[PDB]
Design a protein around this ligand. Structure first.
Ligand SMILES: COc1cc2c(c(OC)c1OC)[C@H](c1cc(Br)ccc1F)CC(=O)N2
Length: 127
């Protein structure tokens, strides 16, 4: 029934890098998805209290959202691009796990994911 604490976005002892791939993940990938007309349900953690989804965090054990990803990118939280790509994929997969096909939120996730895949296809080679 209750909400968990959000995912970690700060950890001073976690090793961090700023790489050209992570810069692309923020400037191209995150920015493109964030401005999309279907971005809004994904811009913050699922509030299972407000949304009256008391089973959400009984089913979704690795929550993820673009607000968290945005903070991780802006806080230089990641070591490599694959960590960040995994967060996006967790976010989409959580939606497909919890909801049913044809739900509005699933259609929204699919449109964002299509764009995500198109941008990741042109992830630059590591400098
Ligand atoms: C990522 O998972 C979700 C995030 C949000 C919402 C979700 O409910 C479908 C949701 O799926 C569990 C809410 C919402 C979205 C649509 Br579309 C229709 C009804 C809604 F209650 C609103 C929101 O701000 N975020």
């Amino acid at each position: 029934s209750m909400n968990p604490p959000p995912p970690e976005t700060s950890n001073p002892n976690k090793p961090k890098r700023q790489t050209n791939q992570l810069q692309y993940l923020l400037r191209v990938v995150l920015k493109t998805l964030w401005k999309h007309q279907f971005a809004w349900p994904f811009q913050q953690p699922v509030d299972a209290v407000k949304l009256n989804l008391p089973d959400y965090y009984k089913i979704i054990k690795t929550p993820m959202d673009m607000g968290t990803i945005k903070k991780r990118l802006e806080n230089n939280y990641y070591w490599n691009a694959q960590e960040c790509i995994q967060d996006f994929n967790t976010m989409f997969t959580n939606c497909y796990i919890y909801n049913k096909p044809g739900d509005d939120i699933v259609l929204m996730a699919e449109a964002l994911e299509k764009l995500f895949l198109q941008k990741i296809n042109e992830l630059p080679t590591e400098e």
